[PDB]
């Protein structure tokens, strides 16, 4: 509850910075650097998972990988709330791996999303990802992105800037 949000915030906090070495570029899944082309996430890894509800509604949620089957090219993932029937069998294109390192803005600004980029971002106090534009990338290792969520309750179509951690901003694989 409040417990879940504490865990999720800690997961964002404890995501390690990538400390390369001078002269080295950061790995896939550092910050905004995409996964390698045929990548399969490991059991226990955190992902954004696109869940199709029984009525057809599509929502990206925060989840944890349980398994992957070469037999079918599908994952099982568990909704991070771990409530009720938490498990979902999903195609690989419905899974985006979350970053496994924070990009350090001093050393690897190239591995951050930039102003005006369209992203999926976890909405504060929720476990769901939604379309957003980057308002500001972080400038300190500890800092969040600032993003503008699409939000039709505003005449201009966007939220004010809201903070979302690096762990919880990924490439936008959702149509409007």
């Amino acid at each position: 509850r409040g417990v879940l949000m504490t865990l999720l915030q800690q997961s964002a906090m404890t995501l390690p910075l990538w400390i390369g070495k001078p002269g080295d570029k950061p790995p896939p899944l550092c910050g905004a650097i995409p996964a390698s082309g045929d990548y399969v996430a490991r059991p226990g890894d955190k992902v954004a998972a696109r869940v199709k509800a029984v009525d057809g509604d599509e929502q990206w949620i925060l989840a944890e990988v349980v398994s992957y089957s070469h037999a079918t090219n599908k994952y099982e993932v568990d909704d991070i709330d771990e409530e009720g029937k938490e498990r979902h069998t999903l195609s690989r294109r419905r899974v985006i791996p979350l970053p496994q390192w924070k990009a350090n803005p001093e050393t690897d600004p190239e591995a951050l999303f930039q102003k005006e980029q369209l992203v999926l971002a976890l909405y504060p106090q929720t476990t769901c990802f939604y379309r957003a534009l980057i308002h500001a990338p972080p400038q300190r290792p500890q800092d969040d992105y600032s993003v503008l969520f699409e939000d039709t309750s505003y005449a201009d179509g966007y939220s004010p800037p809201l903070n979302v951690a690096q762990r919880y901003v990924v490439a936008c694989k959702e149509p409007k």
Partner: peptide
């Protein structure tokens, strides 16, 4: 999941 917890939605907006």
């Amino acid at each position: 999941a917890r939605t907006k």
